Coordinates of C-alpha atoms and ligand atoms in Angstrom, one line a residue:
Chain A
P1 CA 68.0 91.2 105.9
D2 CA 64.6 93.0 105.9
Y3 CA 64.0 91.5 102.4
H4 CA 64.7 87.9 103.3
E5 CA 61.1 87.0 102.8
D6 CA 60.7 89.2 99.7
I7 CA 63.6 87.5 98.0
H8 CA 62.5 83.9 98.9
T9 CA 59.1 84.6 97.4
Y10 CA 60.9 85.9 94.3
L11 CA 63.2 83.0 94.1
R12 CA 60.2 80.7 94.4
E13 CA 58.6 82.6 91.5
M14 CA 61.7 82.5 89.4
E15 CA 62.6 78.8 89.9
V16 CA 59.3 77.9 88.2
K17 CA 60.2 80.0 85.1
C18 CA 63.9 79.2 84.9
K19 CA 63.0 75.5 84.7
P20 CA 64.3 73.1 82.0
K21 CA 62.1 70.6 80.1
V22 CA 62.1 67.5 82.4
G23 CA 62.0 65.1 79.4
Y24 CA 64.5 66.8 77.0
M25 CA 66.9 63.9 77.0
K26 CA 64.5 61.4 75.4
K27 CA 64.2 63.9 72.5
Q28 CA 67.9 64.3 72.2
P29 CA 69.2 62.0 69.4
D30 CA 72.8 61.4 70.3
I31 CA 73.4 62.1 74.0
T32 CA 72.5 60.4 77.1
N33 CA 72.0 60.9 80.9
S34 CA 75.3 59.1 81.3
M35 CA 77.1 61.5 79.0
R36 CA 75.6 64.4 80.9
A37 CA 76.7 62.9 84.2
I38 CA 80.2 62.4 83.0
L39 CA 80.1 66.1 81.9
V40 CA 78.8 67.4 85.2
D41 CA 81.4 65.4 87.1
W42 CA 84.1 66.9 84.9
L43 CA 82.7 70.4 85.7
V44 CA 83.2 69.7 89.4
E45 CA 86.9 68.8 88.8
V46 CA 87.3 72.0 86.7
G47 CA 85.8 73.9 89.7
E48 CA 88.3 72.4 92.0
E49 CA 91.3 73.1 89.7
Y50 CA 90.4 76.8 89.2
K51 CA 88.9 77.2 92.7
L52 CA 85.5 78.4 91.6
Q53 CA 82.5 78.9 93.9
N54 CA 79.9 76.1 94.3
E55 CA 77.2 78.6 93.0
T56 CA 79.2 78.7 89.7
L57 CA 78.9 75.0 89.3
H58 CA 75.1 75.1 90.0
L59 CA 74.6 77.9 87.5
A60 CA 76.6 76.2 84.9
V61 CA 74.4 73.0 85.1
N62 CA 71.2 75.2 85.0
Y63 CA 72.6 76.7 81.8
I64 CA 73.5 73.4 80.2
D65 CA 70.1 71.8 81.0
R66 CA 68.1 74.8 79.7
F67 CA 70.2 74.9 76.5
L68 CA 69.9 71.1 75.9
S69 CA 66.1 71.7 76.4
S70 CA 65.9 73.4 73.0
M71 CA 69.0 72.4 71.0
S72 CA 70.2 69.1 69.6
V73 CA 73.9 68.5 70.4
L74 CA 76.2 65.7 69.2
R75 CA 78.6 63.8 71.6
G76 CA 81.6 65.6 70.3
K77 CA 80.1 69.0 71.0
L78 CA 78.5 68.4 74.4
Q79 CA 81.7 69.4 76.1
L80 CA 82.0 72.6 74.2
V81 CA 78.5 73.5 75.5
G82 CA 79.5 72.7 79.0
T83 CA 82.7 74.7 78.7
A84 CA 80.9 77.8 77.5
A85 CA 78.4 77.3 80.3
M86 CA 81.1 77.2 82.9
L87 CA 82.7 80.3 81.4
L88 CA 79.4 82.2 81.5
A89 CA 78.6 81.2 85.0
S90 CA 82.1 82.4 86.1
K91 CA 81.6 85.8 84.5
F92 CA 78.3 86.1 86.3
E93 CA 79.2 84.7 89.7
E94 CA 83.0 85.0 90.3
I95 CA 84.7 88.1 91.6
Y96 CA 86.9 87.7 88.7
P97 CA 86.4 84.7 86.2
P98 CA 89.2 82.8 84.6
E99 CA 89.9 84.2 81.2
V100 CA 88.9 82.2 78.1
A101 CA 92.4 80.9 77.5
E102 CA 92.2 79.0 80.8
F103 CA 88.9 77.2 79.8
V104 CA 90.4 76.2 76.5
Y105 CA 93.4 74.7 78.5
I106 CA 91.3 72.3 80.5
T107 CA 89.3 71.0 77.5
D108 CA 92.8 69.8 76.5
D109 CA 92.9 71.7 73.2
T110 CA 90.0 69.6 71.9
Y111 CA 88.4 73.1 71.2
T112 CA 89.6 76.5 70.1
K113 CA 89.4 79.9 71.8
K114 CA 87.4 80.9 68.8
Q115 CA 85.0 78.0 69.1
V116 CA 84.4 78.6 72.8
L117 CA 83.6 82.3 72.3
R118 CA 81.3 81.3 69.4
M119 CA 79.5 78.9 71.7
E120 CA 79.3 81.6 74.4
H121 CA 77.5 83.7 71.9
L122 CA 75.1 80.9 71.0
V123 CA 74.3 80.0 74.6
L124 CA 73.6 83.6 75.4
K125 CA 71.3 83.8 72.4
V126 CA 69.5 80.6 73.3
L127 CA 69.1 81.6 77.0
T128 CA 68.3 85.1 75.9
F129 CA 70.8 86.5 78.4
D130 CA 68.8 85.3 81.4
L131 CA 71.5 84.0 83.6
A132 CA 70.4 84.9 87.2
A133 CA 68.7 81.5 87.8
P134 CA 67.8 80.2 91.2
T135 CA 69.9 77.2 92.4
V136 CA 69.8 74.6 95.1
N137 CA 72.7 76.6 96.6
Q138 CA 70.7 79.8 96.9
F139 CA 67.9 78.0 98.7
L140 CA 70.3 76.1 101.0
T141 CA 71.7 79.5 102.0
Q142 CA 68.2 80.8 103.0
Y143 CA 67.5 77.6 104.9
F144 CA 70.8 77.7 106.8
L145 CA 69.8 80.9 108.6
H146 CA 67.0 78.8 110.3
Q147 CA 69.5 76.7 112.2
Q148 CA 68.9 77.5 115.9
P149 CA 72.4 76.3 116.6
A150 CA 74.4 76.6 113.4
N151 CA 76.4 73.5 112.6
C152 CA 79.2 73.4 110.0
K153 CA 79.1 69.6 109.4
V154 CA 75.4 69.9 108.6
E155 CA 76.1 72.8 106.2
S156 CA 78.8 70.9 104.4
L157 CA 76.8 67.7 104.3
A158 CA 73.8 69.5 102.9
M159 CA 76.0 71.1 100.2
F160 CA 77.3 67.7 99.4
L161 CA 73.9 66.2 98.8
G162 CA 72.7 69.1 96.8
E163 CA 75.8 68.8 94.6
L164 CA 75.3 65.0 94.1
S165 CA 71.8 65.9 92.8
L166 CA 73.4 67.7 89.9
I167 CA 74.9 64.5 88.5
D168 CA 71.8 62.5 87.6
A169 CA 69.2 64.3 85.4
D170 CA 66.9 61.4 86.3
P171 CA 65.3 61.7 88.9
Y172 CA 66.3 65.3 89.9
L173 CA 65.4 67.2 86.8
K174 CA 61.8 66.8 87.9
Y175 CA 62.3 68.4 91.3
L176 CA 62.6 72.2 91.9
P177 CA 65.7 73.7 93.5
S178 CA 63.8 74.8 96.6
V179 CA 62.6 71.2 97.1
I180 CA 65.9 69.5 96.5
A181 CA 67.4 72.0 99.0
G182 CA 64.7 71.0 101.4
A183 CA 65.4 67.3 101.2
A184 CA 69.2 68.0 101.3
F185 CA 68.9 70.2 104.4
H186 CA 66.7 67.7 106.2
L187 CA 68.8 64.7 105.4
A188 CA 72.0 66.4 106.4
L189 CA 70.5 67.7 109.6
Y190 CA 69.1 64.2 110.4
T191 CA 72.3 62.5 109.6
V192 CA 74.6 64.7 111.7
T193 CA 72.4 65.8 114.7
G194 CA 69.2 63.7 114.4
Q195 CA 67.1 66.8 114.3
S196 CA 64.4 67.1 111.6
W197 CA 63.2 69.7 109.0
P198 CA 62.4 72.5 111.5
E199 CA 59.1 74.2 112.1
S200 CA 60.3 77.6 111.2
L201 CA 61.1 76.4 107.7
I202 CA 57.7 74.8 107.3
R203 CA 56.3 78.3 107.9
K204 CA 58.8 79.9 105.6
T205 CA 58.4 77.5 102.6
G206 CA 55.2 75.8 103.3
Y207 CA 57.1 72.5 102.7
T208 CA 56.2 69.7 105.1
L209 CA 58.3 66.6 105.8
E210 CA 55.4 65.0 104.0
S211 CA 55.7 66.9 100.8
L212 CA 59.5 66.5 100.7
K213 CA 59.1 62.8 101.1
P214 CA 59.2 61.9 97.4
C215 CA 62.4 63.9 96.7
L216 CA 63.7 62.9 100.1
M217 CA 63.3 59.3 99.2
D218 CA 65.4 59.7 96.0
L219 CA 68.0 61.7 97.7
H220 CA 68.5 59.1 100.4
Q221 CA 68.8 56.4 97.7
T222 CA 71.5 58.5 96.0
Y223 CA 73.3 59.1 99.2
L224 CA 73.4 55.4 100.1
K225 CA 74.7 54.5 96.7
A226 CA 77.2 57.3 96.2
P227 CA 80.2 55.1 96.8
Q228 CA 79.1 52.9 93.9
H229 CA 78.5 55.8 91.5
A230 CA 80.6 55.8 88.3
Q231 CA 81.1 59.5 89.0
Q232 CA 83.3 60.2 92.1
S233 CA 84.6 63.8 91.8
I234 CA 82.0 65.2 94.3
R235 CA 82.8 62.5 97.0
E236 CA 86.5 63.2 96.5
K237 CA 86.0 67.0 96.8
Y238 CA 83.9 66.6 100.0
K239 CA 86.5 64.6 101.9
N240 CA 88.6 67.8 101.9
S241 CA 88.9 69.3 105.3
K242 CA 87.3 72.5 104.1
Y243 CA 84.2 70.3 104.0
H244 CA 85.0 68.5 107.3
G245 CA 85.3 65.3 105.3
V246 CA 81.5 64.8 105.3
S247 CA 81.3 62.5 102.3
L248 CA 82.9 59.9 104.5
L249 CA 80.1 60.1 107.0
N250 CA 77.8 57.1 107.1
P251 CA 74.3 57.7 105.7
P252 CA 71.4 56.8 107.9
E253 CA 70.1 53.2 107.4
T254 CA 66.5 54.6 107.4
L255 CA 64.9 58.0 107.5
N256 CA 61.9 57.8 109.9
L257 CA 59.0 58.7 107.6
Chain B
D1 CA 68.6 96.0 62.5
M2 CA 71.4 98.3 63.6
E3 CA 70.7 100.2 60.3
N4 CA 67.5 101.5 61.8
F5 CA 69.2 103.8 64.3
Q6 CA 70.5 107.3 63.6
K7 CA 73.3 108.4 65.9
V8 CA 72.6 111.9 67.1
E9 CA 75.5 112.6 69.6
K10 CA 77.9 111.1 72.0
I11 CA 76.6 111.4 75.6
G12 CA 78.9 109.0 77.4
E13 CA 82.5 107.6 77.4
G14 CA 84.2 105.1 79.6
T15 CA 86.4 102.0 80.0
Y16 CA 83.2 100.2 79.0
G17 CA 82.9 101.9 75.7
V18 CA 80.7 104.7 74.2
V19 CA 77.1 105.7 74.6
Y20 CA 75.3 107.6 71.8
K21 CA 72.0 109.4 71.8
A22 CA 70.2 107.8 68.8
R23 CA 66.9 108.0 66.9
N24 CA 65.0 104.9 65.7
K25 CA 64.6 105.8 62.0
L26 CA 61.3 103.9 61.7
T27 CA 59.4 104.6 64.9
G28 CA 61.0 107.9 65.8
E29 CA 61.7 106.7 69.4
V30 CA 64.7 108.4 71.0
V31 CA 67.1 106.0 72.6
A32 CA 70.4 105.8 74.5
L33 CA 72.6 103.4 72.6
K34 CA 75.6 101.9 74.4
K35 CA 78.3 100.4 72.2
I36 CA 80.8 97.9 73.6
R37 CA 83.7 96.5 71.5
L38 CA 84.4 92.8 71.9
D39 CA 87.7 90.9 72.2
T40 CA 86.6 88.0 69.9
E41 CA 89.6 85.7 70.6
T42 CA 90.6 86.4 74.3
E43 CA 87.7 87.9 76.2
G44 CA 84.3 87.3 74.7
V45 CA 81.4 89.2 76.3
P46 CA 82.6 91.2 79.3
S47 CA 81.4 90.2 82.8
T48 CA 79.9 93.6 83.5
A49 CA 77.8 93.3 80.4
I50 CA 76.7 89.8 81.4
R51 CA 75.6 91.1 84.7
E52 CA 74.1 94.4 83.6
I53 CA 72.0 92.8 80.9
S54 CA 70.7 89.8 82.8
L55 CA 70.0 91.7 86.0
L56 CA 68.5 94.8 84.3
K57 CA 65.9 92.9 82.4
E58 CA 64.6 91.4 85.7
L59 CA 64.2 94.9 87.1
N60 CA 61.2 96.5 85.4
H61 CA 60.5 99.7 87.4
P62 CA 59.8 103.4 86.7
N63 CA 62.8 104.4 88.8
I64 CA 65.3 102.0 87.1
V65 CA 66.6 102.8 83.7
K66 CA 64.9 100.6 81.1
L67 CA 66.9 98.3 78.9
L68 CA 64.9 98.1 75.7
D69 CA 67.1 95.8 73.6
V70 CA 70.4 93.9 73.2
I71 CA 72.2 93.5 69.8
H72 CA 75.0 91.0 69.7
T73 CA 76.9 90.9 66.4
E74 CA 80.3 89.3 65.6
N75 CA 82.4 92.1 67.2
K76 CA 80.0 94.6 68.7
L77 CA 77.6 94.3 71.6
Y78 CA 74.9 97.0 71.8
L79 CA 72.7 97.8 74.7
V80 CA 69.6 100.0 73.9
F81 CA 68.3 102.0 76.8
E82 CA 65.5 104.6 77.2
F83 CA 67.0 108.1 76.9
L84 CA 67.0 110.5 79.8
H85 CA 68.1 114.1 79.6
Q86 CA 70.7 114.6 82.2
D87 CA 72.5 112.9 85.1
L88 CA 72.2 114.2 88.7
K89 CA 75.8 115.2 88.9
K90 CA 75.5 117.8 86.1
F91 CA 72.2 119.0 87.6
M92 CA 73.8 119.3 91.1
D93 CA 76.6 121.3 89.5
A94 CA 74.3 123.5 87.5
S95 CA 72.4 124.2 90.8
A96 CA 75.3 125.1 93.1
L97 CA 74.4 128.8 93.1
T98 CA 70.7 128.6 93.7
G99 CA 70.7 125.2 95.3
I100 CA 68.3 122.3 94.6
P101 CA 64.8 123.1 96.0
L102 CA 64.0 121.1 99.1
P103 CA 60.7 119.9 97.5
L104 CA 62.7 118.5 94.6
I105 CA 65.3 116.8 96.8
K106 CA 62.5 115.1 98.7
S107 CA 60.9 113.9 95.4
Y108 CA 64.2 112.5 94.1
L109 CA 65.2 110.8 97.4
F110 CA 61.7 109.3 97.5
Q111 CA 62.0 108.0 94.0
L112 CA 65.5 106.7 94.4
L113 CA 64.5 104.7 97.4
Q114 CA 61.7 103.2 95.3
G115 CA 64.1 102.0 92.6
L116 CA 66.4 100.8 95.3
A117 CA 63.8 99.0 97.3
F118 CA 62.9 97.2 94.2
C119 CA 66.4 96.1 93.4
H120 CA 66.9 94.8 96.9
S121 CA 63.6 92.9 97.0
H122 CA 64.8 91.1 93.8
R123 CA 68.2 90.4 95.4
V124 CA 70.3 92.9 93.5
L125 CA 73.0 95.1 94.9
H126 CA 73.8 98.2 92.8
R127 CA 77.0 99.0 94.6
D128 CA 77.9 102.1 92.5
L129 CA 75.3 104.7 93.5
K130 CA 76.8 108.1 92.8
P131 CA 75.4 111.3 91.3
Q132 CA 76.3 110.7 87.7
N133 CA 74.9 107.2 87.6
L134 CA 71.4 108.6 88.5
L135 CA 69.4 110.0 85.6
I136 CA 66.7 112.7 85.4
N137 CA 64.2 113.7 82.7
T138 CA 62.3 116.9 82.3
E139 CA 59.1 115.6 83.9
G140 CA 60.6 115.3 87.4
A141 CA 61.6 111.6 87.3
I142 CA 64.9 110.1 88.5
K143 CA 66.1 106.6 87.7
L144 CA 69.0 104.3 88.8
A145 CA 71.4 103.5 86.0
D146 CA 74.8 101.9 85.3
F147 CA 74.4 98.4 86.8
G148 CA 77.9 97.4 85.7
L149 CA 78.9 96.7 89.3
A150 CA 75.6 95.1 90.3
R151 CA 75.5 91.6 91.8
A152 CA 72.7 89.1 92.6
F153 CA 72.9 88.2 96.3
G154 CA 70.8 85.1 96.6
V155 CA 74.2 83.8 97.7
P156 CA 76.2 86.3 99.8
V157 CA 78.4 88.7 97.8
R158 CA 82.1 88.8 98.8
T159 CA 84.0 92.1 99.0
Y160 CA 86.6 93.0 96.3
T161 CA 90.0 92.8 98.0
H162 CA 90.5 96.0 96.0
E163 CA 87.5 98.2 96.5
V164 CA 84.5 99.0 94.3
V165 CA 82.2 101.9 95.3
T166 CA 83.8 105.2 94.4
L167 CA 85.5 106.4 97.6
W168 CA 83.4 109.4 98.6
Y169 CA 80.2 107.2 98.8
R170 CA 81.8 104.1 100.2
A171 CA 80.4 102.8 103.5
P172 CA 82.3 102.4 106.8
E173 CA 81.9 98.6 106.8
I174 CA 83.8 98.4 103.5
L175 CA 86.5 100.8 104.6
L176 CA 86.9 98.8 107.8
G177 CA 87.1 95.8 105.5
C178 CA 84.3 93.4 106.3
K179 CA 83.9 90.1 104.4
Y180 CA 80.6 90.8 102.6
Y181 CA 78.5 93.5 101.0
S182 CA 74.9 93.9 102.2
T183 CA 72.0 96.1 101.0
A184 CA 73.2 98.6 103.6
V185 CA 76.1 99.9 101.5
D186 CA 73.6 101.1 98.8
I187 CA 71.7 103.0 101.5
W188 CA 74.9 104.6 102.8
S189 CA 75.7 105.9 99.3
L190 CA 72.2 107.3 99.1
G191 CA 72.5 109.1 102.4
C192 CA 75.7 110.8 101.2
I193 CA 73.9 111.8 98.0
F194 CA 71.0 113.1 100.1
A195 CA 73.2 115.3 102.3
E196 CA 75.1 116.4 99.2
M197 CA 72.0 117.7 97.5
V198 CA 71.0 119.6 100.7
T199 CA 74.4 121.2 101.3
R200 CA 75.7 121.6 97.8
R201 CA 78.9 119.8 98.8
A202 CA 80.1 116.2 99.1
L203 CA 79.6 114.9 102.6
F204 CA 82.8 112.9 102.9
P205 CA 85.3 113.9 100.1
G206 CA 88.1 111.7 101.3
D207 CA 91.6 111.6 99.8
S208 CA 92.3 108.0 100.7
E209 CA 90.6 105.1 102.3
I210 CA 92.0 106.2 105.7
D211 CA 91.2 109.9 105.2
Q212 CA 87.7 108.8 104.2
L213 CA 87.2 106.8 107.3
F214 CA 88.3 109.8 109.4
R215 CA 86.2 112.4 107.8
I216 CA 83.3 110.1 108.6
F217 CA 84.5 109.7 112.2
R218 CA 84.8 113.5 112.6
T219 CA 81.1 114.0 111.6
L220 CA 79.5 111.0 113.2
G221 CA 81.8 110.3 116.0
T222 CA 84.3 107.4 116.4
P223 CA 82.3 104.1 116.6
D224 CA 82.7 101.9 119.7
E225 CA 81.3 98.5 120.8
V226 CA 78.1 100.1 122.0
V227 CA 77.2 102.1 118.8
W228 CA 78.3 99.1 116.7
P229 CA 78.8 95.7 118.3
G230 CA 81.9 94.2 116.7
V231 CA 83.6 97.2 115.1
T232 CA 86.8 96.6 117.1
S233 CA 87.1 93.1 115.8
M234 CA 87.0 94.1 112.1
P235 CA 90.1 93.4 110.0
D236 CA 91.1 97.0 109.3
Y237 CA 90.0 98.5 112.6
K238 CA 92.8 99.7 114.9
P239 CA 92.4 100.7 118.6
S240 CA 94.8 103.5 117.8
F241 CA 91.9 105.5 116.3
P242 CA 91.3 109.0 117.6
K243 CA 88.0 109.4 119.4
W244 CA 86.0 112.2 117.8
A245 CA 82.6 113.2 119.1
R246 CA 79.3 113.1 117.1
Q247 CA 78.7 116.4 115.3
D248 CA 75.3 117.8 115.9
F249 CA 73.1 117.1 112.9
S250 CA 71.5 120.6 112.7
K251 CA 75.1 121.8 111.9
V252 CA 75.9 119.0 109.5
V253 CA 72.7 119.7 107.4
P254 CA 71.2 123.0 108.4
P255 CA 68.5 123.3 105.7
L256 CA 66.8 120.2 106.9
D257 CA 63.8 120.0 109.3
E258 CA 63.5 117.5 112.2
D259 CA 62.3 114.8 109.8
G260 CA 65.0 115.2 107.2
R261 CA 67.6 115.0 109.9
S262 CA 66.0 111.9 111.4
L263 CA 66.0 110.0 108.2
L264 CA 69.6 110.9 107.3
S265 CA 70.9 109.8 110.6
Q266 CA 69.2 106.5 110.1
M267 CA 70.7 106.1 106.6
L268 CA 74.2 107.0 108.1
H269 CA 73.9 104.6 111.0
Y270 CA 77.2 102.8 111.8
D271 CA 76.0 99.2 112.3
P272 CA 74.7 98.0 108.9
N273 CA 72.3 95.7 110.7
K274 CA 70.7 98.8 112.1
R275 CA 71.0 101.1 109.1
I276 CA 67.5 101.8 107.9
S277 CA 66.3 99.7 105.0
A278 CA 65.0 101.3 101.8
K279 CA 61.5 99.7 102.3
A280 CA 61.4 101.3 105.7
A281 CA 62.9 104.6 104.6
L282 CA 59.8 105.1 102.4
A283 CA 57.6 104.8 105.5
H284 CA 59.5 107.7 107.2
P285 CA 57.5 110.8 108.1
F286 CA 59.8 112.9 106.0
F287 CA 58.0 111.7 103.0
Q288 CA 54.4 112.3 104.3
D289 CA 54.1 115.4 102.2
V290 CA 56.2 114.4 99.2
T291 CA 55.4 115.7 95.7
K292 CA 56.8 115.6 92.2
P293 CA 58.2 119.1 91.2
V294 CA 59.8 119.4 87.8
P295 CA 63.4 120.6 87.5
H296 CA 64.3 123.5 85.4
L297 CA 66.9 121.8 83.2
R298 CA 69.5 123.9 81.4
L299 CA 70.1 121.6 78.5
Ligands
WXV1 C1 78.1 102.6 81.8 N1 77.2 103.7 81.3 C2 75.9 103.5 81.2 O1 75.3 102.5 81.3 C3 75.3 104.8 80.7 N2 76.0 105.9 80.5 N3 75.1 106.8 80.1 C4 75.6 108.2 79.8 C5 73.8 106.4 80.0 C6 73.8 105.0 80.4 C7 72.6 104.1 80.4 C8 71.3 104.7 79.7 C9 71.3 106.2 79.4 C10 70.2 107.0 79.1 N4 70.2 108.3 78.8 C11 71.4 109.0 79.0 N5 71.4 110.3 78.8 C12 72.6 111.1 78.9 C13 73.2 111.3 80.3 C14 73.1 112.7 80.9 N6 73.7 113.7 80.0 S1 74.6 114.9 80.5 C15 76.2 114.4 80.3 O2 74.4 116.1 79.7 O3 74.4 115.0 82.0 C16 73.4 113.6 78.5 C17 72.3 112.5 78.2 N7 72.6 108.3 79.4 C18 72.6 107.1 79.6

């Protein structure tokens, strides 16, 4: 709009504050990056079953990561956390969220309605009701306006890469949303059209191909290996025709950096 | 903790719950205490509360009601707000005889645009701007309240298949059924409230979606592809719409000078892309001489 720049600046401010402890997992006695990846991959499925927005998925992971940043959680309860996170993200983001009953259903009656609402209370307390966090998604949406010709395969592919980034706390927990979005938008744009991170976005964000390079190196690595990843729900989702089957596209053999 | 408030009187009721005026027994502070009852087995914390709380504590501003505290017990959720004396609906009603002084209208519309410009710059749509959701104190201040319908739009906000904004203040784009909200629908509402303060009467008191659309058409003229590129392609637009002509604005709002009319016509612009922004409205000449009168409030 007329606030496009005011909001980007504010998102950039906020993403630094709504940031989770990059090393929380080492301090966590009983769970594991692999358990978390299994969890996030499950949340993607749930999102497909109940037809939730991508933004909801991103917010939920933000919530889970901030929450695990200050609370020890055992294996058997990690899914209860993730379920309450998804529920909260839905209330915040969806036009109307599934009711609690439906989140208890897809945990397979491992947990109770009562437990999930109890956990909702606790997550709200721990996050002090601060739910409007910036996400890769929000930054990708800003960046998309700066396509001279808008290209739908590029948008889907960028979304795909951003979402893959949610699976692996290492490395991505150490990058900011605006930066991951940068790498994701460049890599997608380069893969589909051959174009590169555009000048206008350099001006908008102050990010240069040079500064994205580290995150861009990781994202390319992830992209190349995605078919070998134990977690496959994102690749499956992104062969849908609503995403132009982009996850079947071949990743570039080399960037040109 | 909840022991330290004394309830003084009910000041609000709704689907949402109740609001009491209350007194902090220890500090003496006077507060507006909203009580929500929780469904502890099948609902949890309601979505409007999730959104009101988390958005409202990002928006610290003098023209946006201040959320002072949240108390979350087993079954009750309390929101503690700053207390204001009166909403703008009851003041507009109390002032139907004498009218609201133009100096005061300018003050309020200046303030409201400040609170609104602040929301939009922090990617928040209010989406329910209407007279009784705006609050006034005795020192001449007015603040945006009731953010139950507010949304963050860092990602675009999709339009409720079954509408949202109370009908009289609802914007053409929504009635014609566009896919997304924008900041412009908040401006529209504010234009209507503006006019309504000037004329003592609701600008577009429609009886139904379609009657609303037409009352608008009869005052602003029926939009075509020149005045609004794309109207004729919108889902709920029909080519079988009667062509009305644009009413002259000195008849629509007489009491206004050349500046007041200019601003209002920019807030009521058909194409949302062209409808004046709140940041820009504040730069308008109309506000060059603005001041801060104090209302005479009949409590
Ligand atoms: C969802 N609802 C809300 O969020 C809400 N509803 N009300 C009535 C108020 C809200 C928020 C803080 C408030 C702070 N002060 C006041 N004061 C009252 C409003 C105006 N009048 S009145 C009825 O005489 O015009 C009495 C005092 N009301 C507040």
